[PDB]
Amino acid sequence: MNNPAIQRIEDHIVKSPEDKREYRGLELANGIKVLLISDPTTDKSSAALDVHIGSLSDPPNIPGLSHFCEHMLFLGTKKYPKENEYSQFLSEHAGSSNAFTSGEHTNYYFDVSHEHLEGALDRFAQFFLCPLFDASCKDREVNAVDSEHEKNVMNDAWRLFQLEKATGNPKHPFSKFGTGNKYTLETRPNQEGIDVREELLKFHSTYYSSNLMAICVLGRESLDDLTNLVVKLFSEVENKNVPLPEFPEHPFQEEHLKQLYKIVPIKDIRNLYVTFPIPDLQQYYKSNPGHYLGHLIGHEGPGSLLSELKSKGWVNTLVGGQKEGARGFMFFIINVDLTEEGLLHVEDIILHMFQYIQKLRAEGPQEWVFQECKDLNAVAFRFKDKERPRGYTSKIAGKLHYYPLNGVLTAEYLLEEFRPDLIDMVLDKLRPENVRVAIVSKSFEGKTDRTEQWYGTQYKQEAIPEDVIQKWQNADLNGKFKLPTKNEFIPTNFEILALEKDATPYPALIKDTAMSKLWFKQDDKFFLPKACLNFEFFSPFAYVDPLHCNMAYLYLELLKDSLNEYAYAAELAGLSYDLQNTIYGMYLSVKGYNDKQPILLKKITEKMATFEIDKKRFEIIKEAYMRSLNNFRAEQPHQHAMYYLRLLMTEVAWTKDELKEALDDVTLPRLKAFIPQLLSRLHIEALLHGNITKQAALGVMQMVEDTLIEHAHTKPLLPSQLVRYREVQLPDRGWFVYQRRNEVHNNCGIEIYYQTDMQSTSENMFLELFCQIISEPCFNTLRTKEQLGYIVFSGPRRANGIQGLRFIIQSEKPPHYLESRVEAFLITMEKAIEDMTEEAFQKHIQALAIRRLDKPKKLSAECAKYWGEIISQQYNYDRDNIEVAYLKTLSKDDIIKFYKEMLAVDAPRRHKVSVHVLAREMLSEAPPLPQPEVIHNMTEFKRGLPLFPLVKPH
Amino acid sequence: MNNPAIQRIEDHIVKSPEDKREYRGLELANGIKVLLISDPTTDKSSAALDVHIGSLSDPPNIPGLSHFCEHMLFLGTKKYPKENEYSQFLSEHAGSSNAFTSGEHTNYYFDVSHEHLEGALDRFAQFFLCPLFDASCKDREVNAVDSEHEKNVMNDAWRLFQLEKATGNPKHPFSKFGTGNKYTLETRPNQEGIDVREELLKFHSTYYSSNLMAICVLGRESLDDLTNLVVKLFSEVENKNVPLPEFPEHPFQEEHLKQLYKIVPIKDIRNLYVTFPIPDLQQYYKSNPGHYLGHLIGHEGPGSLLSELKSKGWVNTLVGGQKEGARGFMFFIINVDLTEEGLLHVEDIILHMFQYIQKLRAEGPQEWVFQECKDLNAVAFRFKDKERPRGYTSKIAGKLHYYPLNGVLTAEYLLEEFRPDLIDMVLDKLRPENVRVAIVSKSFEGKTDRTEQWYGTQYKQEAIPEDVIQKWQNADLNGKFKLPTKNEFIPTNFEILALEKDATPYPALIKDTAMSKLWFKQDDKFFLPKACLNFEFFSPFAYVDPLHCNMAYLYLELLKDSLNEYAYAAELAGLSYDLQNTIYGMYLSVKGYNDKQPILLKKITEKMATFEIDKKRFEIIKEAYMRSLNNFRAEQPHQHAMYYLRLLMTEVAWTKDELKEALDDVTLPRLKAFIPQLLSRLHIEALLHGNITKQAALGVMQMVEDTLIEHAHTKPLLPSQLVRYREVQLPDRGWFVYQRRNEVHNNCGIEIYYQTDMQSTSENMFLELFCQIISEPCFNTLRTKEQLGYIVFSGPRRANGIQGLRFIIQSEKPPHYLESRVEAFLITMEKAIEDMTEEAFQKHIQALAIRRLDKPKKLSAECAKYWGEIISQQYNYDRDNIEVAYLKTLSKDDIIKFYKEMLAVDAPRRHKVSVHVLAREMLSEAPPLPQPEVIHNMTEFKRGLPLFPLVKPH
Ligand SMILES: [Zn+2]
Ligand SMILES: [Zn+2]
C-alpha cells in the first residue's frame, strides 16, 4: 500500500526516549536506504548520501580515481551546470558542504537553512544523476588533489597509514594509494593515452548505483513531507545492480607476518606499533568481541598493561583494540609511545603485551566486564547529546549500509548477548606468530634502504628472529597485571532537578568574593543529567617568565600523569576532565554526568594542593616536553603562520624558542618550591552549568575553595590587582612582515591579517558580514580557479578584545605571490560588492543571521559559548540577538565605506601585518603594494607600538 | 694704596689646592665684607648679600616685619620701578633668585648667565639703596606671606619650631613669631592706626646698614674687574653704624627648665625631644666643643647610645649635638623617634641618655677622637665637590659675618687646637637640672589645655617631678655603652688614576651579559678621589603585586636597619650608600671616596645574599612602615596631587591604599621565603663612574655578581624577558579629573597636566621653550598679581618616555577656580607670545640654552645625569648639545602652532588630566571649559585607554 517507489517503510526506529526528533526509515524500490529525521525546532536542515564505494575499487592503473570523482561532482551537473552552483547556493543560505572518500565509502553531506532544504537537496540530487565532469575543471581540480596530497606528505600519521598498505599483499586492493595526485590522475594516464574523463564517467556509471546508496535527511518538514521530497528527487537514481565489493582474503598473508619495520619519522617521536590481522567482526556487532578485548588490553590505570609499562618507565600512553580494514578483514592493534628507555626495550615491551594477553587466555571471558560495558553504552545512548545536523546525517548515511533501518541509531551502542566463544576466537589471533611490529624513531635515519613511493617514507624491513618470536610465545604470566576492578564512577542518579523559580536564561553572578567569582546557570532546555564545571585559577606566577610558564605546564602534566589511573574509570563512565596552564594561571574543566562530579573534582583539587612529585616521572615528562617543543618545527606552515601572528599581536607571549631555553633551568627542587608559591595566592572564576541547582553550584565552589585553603593555605588575590594582556595596536597605513623558515615542508604558509578595531556590536558585524560575503568567492577564486593550494581560508580573527580580517594559505607558491593574489582578490570583492543586488545582499545578511542565531544543541556547546564571554571578560550573554539586530540594518554602502576606511590598499586606516613561513627550499590585476617594514625581533617590534585598551564588560 | 672705597684687601684666602677658582676678600670702607670669586669656566655667575639682621629684630608689635621686608625688596626700586624687573631680568638671562629670613640674617641671592652679571648685580644692588615699598604691592604681597604661613601651619616641624619659642622667656626676642601673616602685618596694625609702610621704611632705614652687610660674588671676570664692579655698585650703601644685635641672656631661664611638654602632632609620629640650653660656642669654632660632644652622643652603631635604645626596642633613630640659637645662646639637643614600647618608657630612655653622658664625664675628653674628626674634616675640605654658584655665594655671604676674610672658606672644616676644658665646660650643662623634654604623640589628643597662638598647636605643659629628676641625676654607669672604636673606613689612598688611552667622554657599555650590563666612565674633568657606583637589580617579583612590593620594601628597610651600625663609620668617613626598592626591583648606590668602596659594597652585597631576619626588628620596622603609609594623608595637598597623577598615568602602580591592605598579609615566614625567590633570578644594570679604571670597574661588577651567585645562587634573567611599564595615552580633546580629599590641610592642591607626546628632540624643545617663556609670567600672574597661593609652579613633566605641561598649585581657593585662572593664563600666554619681539624671543632661547648647557660641577651630579639616561633606557648621553642645537632653530611660529595643536582650549590634540585634592572643608577672562569625565576608579580608567610605545634607545 506504499508509494510505488518505496519497497518498505520502517515506522518504528529505535531511538532514545529523550530524543524528540521523529524518525522514519525507508527502503526505496531502487534499493536506496533512507533515514528521515523530522526536527521542527532545527535552524539548519541537512542531508548526506553515502556511496558504498571507495578507493579500494580504484582501477589498478588510476589510483585515486574514486577520490577525484568525489571532488568533481561538486563542480557541475547538467541541470546545474555552474561550477559552484552548489557551494554558492549553500553559502547564500547559511549552509556548508563537505565530502570524503575512504576505502569503501564516499560520503557527501551538506547543511543549509531549514527554509531552503528542497533547493539544496535538489542541486545535491543531481550529483548522482547527471554530473558534467567538465574538462575545464578536471585539469584545474587535479591540482587541489595534488595539493591535498602534498599537505599530507610530511604528516607522520598519513605516512604510516599508507606504509602499512604498501607492506601488505601487493595484489590486494588494500595496497592501493587512495588520495591520488597529479601524477596518477593526469601525468601517467596521458603518457599512456588514457582519458581520465572517460574513466571518471565509466567509474560513476558502474559503481554509482542506487543499490549501494544510503541517504539521511533532517529537516523541519513532517516525515510525510520528507518522504515525498526524498522519493521525488532520488527514486530515479539508476540501480545498476552492482555487487557490493568484498575482500575475504586478508591483505596480510603469512609472508607478511612476524615482520619488523624500522621507520624514519618527520617529527621526533618514539612510537611502537603492534598489529594483528583479524577476521572481519562487523557481523558480530551486537556482542562486539573486538571491543571487549580492546577495552581490556587498552585499559589504563590499576593493574593495566599501561600502568606497568609506565612504571618501568618505557611507555607513556597506550591504545589498544580493533581497527577497521574493509569488508572481509580487520586488524587488532596495540600502539604505545616510547620513552628513551622504552626504545631500548622494545622487545620486552612486546613481551609484556603478550603476558597481558596470556592472562586473558588463562582467565577467560568475563561476563561482568561485558555486562558493565553494556550498561555504560546503554546510558550513553539514552542520554546522548543532541547532534549537529551535518555530522548526524553523514554518520547515519554511513551506518545504513550495516544495520537494519530500525537498528541504525542504537547499533554500536546497544549490546545484546554476551558471546564468550567470539571473544576466544579473536583472542586466538593475538599471538607472536601473527604479529607485525613497527618502530618509528629518528634513531633509524640514514640507515634504511626502502622508500615507500607515494610518501617517500624511509624505512627498513626485516624478519623478527625466531628466538625472539619464541620468547614471546613462551611469555608466562606476570602477576603484576590484573583485571580492572568494578567501575565505581558508573552513574546511578539521573534525576533531572526541577527548574528553580529564580532560574535565569543566561549565567548569573551568584558569588563575587576576593577569592572566587561564580557564574551559574541551571539548564533550561536540554534536560540531560549532565553538568559543565569550569574553573580558571588566576595567578601571576603562572606566566611571569618562560621558566614559570614551563613550570606551570610541567606541574599540570605531572598532576594529570598522576591522576590518569584513577580518572580513567570516570572517563569510561562518561565523566571527563581537562587541566591546562594558561597565560593567566590554570584552567580546570569537568564535564559529563553530574552525579559523581563532586567525587572527581574533590580528588583533582586535593591532588593539586598536596602534590608530591615523583623524581622519575619528572625526568620523563620533562624529556617529552622538550621534544614537544622542538617538534613544533614539523608542524604545517599554515599553523606556524597562525602561531607567530598570535605571539606578535599580544603584549606578552613567550615563544617556543624562549621556553625551550628556559627549560633546562627547571629542576625538581625548583619546581617543588614553585608549586606552593603558585598555590599560595589565587583568584578563581567559574561557570557551573547544567543539571544543578544554585545550592549545589555554590557547594561545589566551596569544596574547591576550602580544599585549597586547607592543603596549600591559599589566600585571595584581588581581581583588581590582576594584570591582563593588551593587543598591539598597528599604525594607520602600516604594513609589517614577519618571516620565518619551515624546515620540514615544501609548501609555504602565509597569514595576512588586517586589523580593524576593538570589538563592539557595530565593528563586529561590519567585519562578519564582509566575511560572509567573500567567504565562498575566496574559495572559488583562490582555490578553485587560481588553484593556489588546498588550504585557502578567509575569515574573522578575534583576540584580546580586538579583531580583523585574516587570510590563511598553504601553497607551493611563494608568500609575495600569495599576497598579490589576495590583494587582487580584495579589489575584486569590492567591485563585486558594488555590483551586487540588494537581493543578493539581503540573502547574505539572512545567511549570516541564521549562522549566528543557530542555537547549541547540547550542554557542553552552550557552556563553551558562555565560557568564551567570561574568559574574554566581555560577559555578553545576549550577544547573538543584539548583534543580529544590528546586522539586519546594514546596507551595501555601510559595507563599502567600511572596506574603503579599513581594507582597501589605500584605506587611511589599513593596519596590515603578514606572517610568511617559508617552504624549506625558499588572472585579475593585483595592485602595487608598499614596502613592508620587516620584523626581526618581535620584542622590539611590540615596544615601539601602542597597545589597545581592554574591552568594557556588560 | 687701595681704591679709597676699600679699607682692606685680603689677597691670601685659604682654599683647597684642588680649587681652581681665584679668591679675593675685601673690606669696604663702608664696612661691607666681600668675597670675590673668579671662575673663568663658569656658565652662570652669582651673588648673594647677607644682612646680619633678622626676625629677632622685629618690632614687638609687628612680628614678621623683617620677613615682609625681604619679600618687598623684590618688588621695585627707584632706579628699577617695575615690580618684577629683577625676576624678569633673571628669567630672560637663565637666572633665578631666592631669599630667606632667619632670626639674625636676611640672605638674598641670585644666579644669572655669566654674560649679564653686571646687569643683574646692578638691579640687585638697588634693593639696599632705594626700595619702593609700593602700597599697591604691599597689600597684594602680604597674601603670599599669609599663604606661606598657612603652608607651614600643618607641618609638624614648623609647629615644634615655633612652640619651643612660645615656651621660653616671653620677654626674650627669641619668643617672637618670625613668618608673620595677614593678621600681624595688616589686620592688627590697621585696627591700631600703624602704617606698616612707614614701618618697613623705618626698619630698612635703621638696620639695612653697610656695616651689617656681607657680599659674595662669583663671575668669569678677573678679581680686579670684579673688585671695581663691587665697589662701583655697593660702596655707596649707607653705613648707619647700627650696633650688631646681641642676646646674652638665655631665653630659657630656670623657671623654664626641668619642664615636660606633651604635644599633639599632625602626623602620627612618636618623637622624644631632649634639649639643654648652652652658652654660645660660636667663638670656640676652631676647637668646636659642641660638635665633639654632638659626634659622640649622636654616634650610631657599636656601643653607641642608639644601638642600645635600639636593642631595647624603644628607639629607631637618634640625632644629637649642638643647635644654633642666636648670638649669645645655643642649645644642645638629643632627639629620637619612639617605638610603641619606647613611648611607655620615655623616662628610662632619658635615663639611658644621662648614663651615656655620665660615661663621658667619667672618661673625659679624648684627644684621639678630636684628632680623628679633625683629620676627616681636613680631607673633606681638600676634596670638597665644586659647588653650584647660587648655593656657594649665599653660604659664603653668611659665613663672612663670623670669620676672618682669609678664613671664610676653611672655617667649620679645619679644626686647630684640641681644648679639653671647653668640652668639659659644655658637658657640665648636660644635666637633669638643665633639661627640657618634649613628647610628641597622638596619644595626647583631646587632653591638652594649651594652644600655641600662631600654629594652634595643642599641648600640655607640666613640671618633671623631683623624684624623676633625681633618678636621672643618680644615673650610674651602664657598662653597655662604650666609646667609638677607631674609624677603619677613613680613606688613605687619594691617588687620581691616569686617564686611560681609551677613556670616553660618555659612559660606555663595557659588558653586556645575560646577568649584567655595565656602563662605565672614568672621570675626565673633576679629578677628585671619588667614585659613583649605581646598581639597578631587576626582578619581576619586586612589584608583581602590592604584597611583594611591601615585602621588597621591608626587606631593604631591615637590611639597612641591620647595616647601620657598621656603615655609620663609612658615612662619617665620606663613604655613603643608598638602598631602595623600585618598581623594577632594587636600587643600590654607593658614593664617596673610591678607596674603601669595595669594602662597603662587598659587605652590603654579602649581607643581602645571606640575610637572616631578626623577629623583633621585623615587627618594629613593619609597625613603622604601617604608620608611614597612613601618615601620607598628612602630606601637603600639592604633593598628593603630584602623587595621584603619577599613579594615574602609569600602566601599573600600587596605591598607598592597596599597600596598607596587603601589609597585614606580610609575615616573617612569608618574607623569609620571599627573599631567596627575589634573589634567585636577577638582571643587573650598573653605572660605575669616577676615579676608576675599566679594570677596576669590571672587578667591582664581578665581586657583586659572584657574591650573589655563591650565597643566593642567583641566575641570569634575560633583559628581553623583562616587562617595562608604559604610560597611559589620553584621547584627543579628552579631559579627565580625579578628585580626592586631603583630610588635614585647609588648602587644596591641584595638578593640571597637558600630555603632549612621546619624548624626542623636537617635542622636548617645543615643550621646554614654551615652559621657559611662561615660567616667570606664571609666577607673576598667578602668584604675584592674582595671589592664588604661595605654591604656584609650572613646567615640564617627564615619565615613562612621555611628557607634557604641568601646573601645580596649593590654594585657599577651590580647584575649579584655579583651573579657570590657569586657562585664563594660557590664553594670555598665547597673545603675549604672538606680540613678542623676535628679540625677546631670542633671549628666551638663549636663556634656555644656557640652563641646558650648564655643566655639572661635581661627580655625583654628572653621575645622576647619566643614570637618568640609563634608568629611562634612553641612553642619550649627548642629549644636551643635540637638543640645544634644535632649540636655536625654533621660531615664534613653531611655538604658536605647537600651542594651537596641543595646548589651546580648542586644540585638536589637547590631552588634559587634572588631579584635584580638596581642602579638608571643601581679572583676565577665563574661557568656557568642557565637562570633564570624572575618574572614580583608577584601574577601570586605565583599562579603557590605550598605552604608549616605549621610547627607542640610541
Ligand atoms: Zn579531497
Ligand atoms: Zn617668604
Author numbering:
A (entry chain A), B (entry chain A): 42 to 963, 980 to 1011
Relevant lines from the article:
Insulysin (EC 3.4.24.56; also referred to as insulin-degrading enzyme or IDE) is a zinc metallopeptidase in the M16 family that has been extensively studied because of its role in cellular insulin degradation and amyloid beta peptide catabolism. IDE exists predominantly as a dimer in equilibrium with tetramers and to a lesser extent monomers. It is unique among the enzymes comprising the zinc metallopeptidase M16 family in that it exhibits allosteric kinetic behavior with substrate peptides increasing its activity. Crystal structures of human IDE (hIDE) complexed with peptides show that the enzyme consists of four structurally related domains that adopt a clamshell-like structure enclosing a large central chamber.
We report here the crystal structures of rat IDE (rIDE) and a catalytically compromised mutant form, rIDE-E111F. The structures of wild type and E111F rIDE are very similar to the published structures of peptide bound and unliganded human IDE (hIDE). The four structurally similar domains each have an α+β fold and arrange to form the same closed clamshell conformation as hIDE, with the N- and C-terminal halves of the clamshell connected by a single polypeptide chain. In the closed conformation, the two halves of the clamshell are in contact with one another forming an enclosed cavity, and the active site of the enzyme is accessible from this internal substrate-binding chamber. Bound peptides are presumably not seen associated with wild type rIDE because the polyhistidine fusion sequences are degraded by the active enzyme. Comparison of the ligand free rIDE structure and the rIDE-E111F structure with ligand bound at the distal and active sites suggests a likely structural basis for allosterism. As already noted, the crystallographic thermal factors for the first two domains of the ligand bound mutant are consistently higher than those for the unliganded enzyme. This difference may reflect a higher relative mobility of the two halves of the peptide bound enzyme, which would be consistent with a weakening of the interface. The observed conformational shift at the dimer interface between ligand free wild type enzyme and ligand bound rIDE-E111F reported here suggests a possible structural basis for this communication.
